[PDB]
Design a protein around this ligand. Sequence first.
Ligand code: UED
Ligand code: UED
Lengths: 299, 299
Amino acid sequence: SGLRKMAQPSGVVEPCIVRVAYGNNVLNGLWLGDEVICPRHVIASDTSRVINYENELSSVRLHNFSIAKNNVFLGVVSAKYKGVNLVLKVNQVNPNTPEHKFKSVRPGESFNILACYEGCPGSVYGVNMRSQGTIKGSFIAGTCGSVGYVLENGTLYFVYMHHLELGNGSHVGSNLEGEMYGGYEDQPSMQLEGTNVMSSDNVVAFLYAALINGERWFVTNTSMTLESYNSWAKTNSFTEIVSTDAFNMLAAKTGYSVEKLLECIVRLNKGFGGRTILSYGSLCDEFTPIEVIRQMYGV
Amino acid sequence: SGLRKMAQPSGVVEPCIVRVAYGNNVLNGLWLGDEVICPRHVIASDTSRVINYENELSSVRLHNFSIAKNNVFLGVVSAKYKGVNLVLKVNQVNPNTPEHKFKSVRPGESFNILACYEGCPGSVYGVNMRSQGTIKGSFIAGTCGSVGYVLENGTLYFVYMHHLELGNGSHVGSNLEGEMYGGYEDQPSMQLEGTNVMSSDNVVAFLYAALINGERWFVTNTSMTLESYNSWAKTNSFTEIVSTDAFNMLAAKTGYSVEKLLECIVRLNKGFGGRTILSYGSLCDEFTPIEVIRQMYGV
Ligand SMILES: *[C@@H](O)[C@H](C[C@@H]1CCNC1=O)NC(=O)[C@H](CC(C)C)NC(=O)OCc1ccccc1
Ligand SMILES: *[C@@H](O)[C@H](C[C@@H]1CCNC1=O)NC(=O)[C@H](CC(C)C)NC(=O)OCc1ccccc1
């Protein structure tokens, strides 16, 4: 089997992607109702030097937007900022607007990326939000405005819109309220990412996935109290676990308690000593308990 | 940027997925026009024992079929085998039939999986055909009939439908004409997968991907002739590389010849020294050259 990232199906999102162009900039927007949301730097005169967003908005030429998807062309009625996004009122309502909500993801939470190029959906893949508000994706020029979404209990949530890449290659975006994850600015200046704190919950999930896949060299009958692991995590840039509850099913199927896997984390946090788990050379925190449960058992 | 296995968007496929139930079996089918294609073992009395497909077909009663797509009830008009698939003529035309073709994938080629459960699309992810005609596909019970597809040259091709899992965990399916990849039978019987042979072309692509992403610890200026590499590969379960032409753009952009990366391959197959390469602990052959070119540079 193995453990691989998957994405939820993208069909309900694709009809919402449009191409937004202004001046020499082209990126993607999200068309819902009679509004299109896109990163505000599309109206920046020059995206390599610092941008004065007040000047850009007050001087904006609504008729100088080009917004299109296939046989649809959209006129801009009015424009405003909401955080780091432009909210553009347009003169047509999207006939394929799905029921949807907006919410923010938190560190350790997984979601899907619909990566789009110049208004055209190209690829769909799963990611996971890190403590500093970055994701490791695969964005290149033309993919700003790409959208992250999650389906929960049949509800479509929009959670991410892509804005920029940091000097170290990490990817940064906003929620659909225009709040940038991790507090970064939509400027080219160059910005630092601090140290990410690993999701302990997701690492446990990972080890359970390994066990289900038959690998067991890393496990023993020694256990380490939550209560004690949390004291360690703390000072080792690992999150601390509130309860063992999310794992009860996975413990049942495997026969191994959480407390036994906490020992593994503390022994292996430096590395595998030339060994591997699900082909990775070190601990992976990009898979949630629910992600793993669903991939191994279809729940 | 980085290297993620990506899937092409699934929207054009999702309206084609239907639930197919018969006897004690529930799986997925592909509804195109007035036809539903699904694995023929859906009519098997007992899928845990050897199946006589002639007896099962003579015993079929069309009213025991239940086929559904949301609120649509698809009545079965007639049934026949085509290879290892059932082709069911149904009493309604799919109004969302996309323009499409059928084609077979070959070892080393990438394509997308839309994994479906009880007729409901669940996940989408990219895979790559292995030398023995298998994929590592994350399939579990209830996912038979899941579809593989690729969007290439402006057309949607259906290339895979899921049938079974081998004793070693590999997954086996057919093309949509009903020929099982790798010559496997649609029986619960035990079937052997020979040795997996890695696509050398895809491994070079992968290492170029690493170079483009700034990872360079494994490379040196020592090179190895194409002829020497193929002589090595013949006895080390790697394919032989016909010529270096497909990599010219990647060679130009990185400054490294294929012949240097060939030497790299021969050195890293003995082990990584506990190191990692785009986070993998061993060589990965799941990305084609054009897949890598397009993810890193677009167009
Ligand atoms: C989309 O407009 C674009 C996506 C970047 C480009 C390369 N990989 C990405 O994620 N965003 C920008 O170009 C962005 C706009 C600023 C005004 C915030 N600037 C940016 O990301 O610069 C950093 C960078 C540019 C090009 C390659 C590598 C890093
Ligand atoms: C879909 O009907 C199912 C998908 C299998 C189930 C487990 N993982 C998959 O991909 N296919 C079968 O159950 C198939 C039935 C025909 C061969 C008659 N048999 C099969 O795959 O048996 C091997 C196996 C069964 C259950 C768990 C693990 C391996």
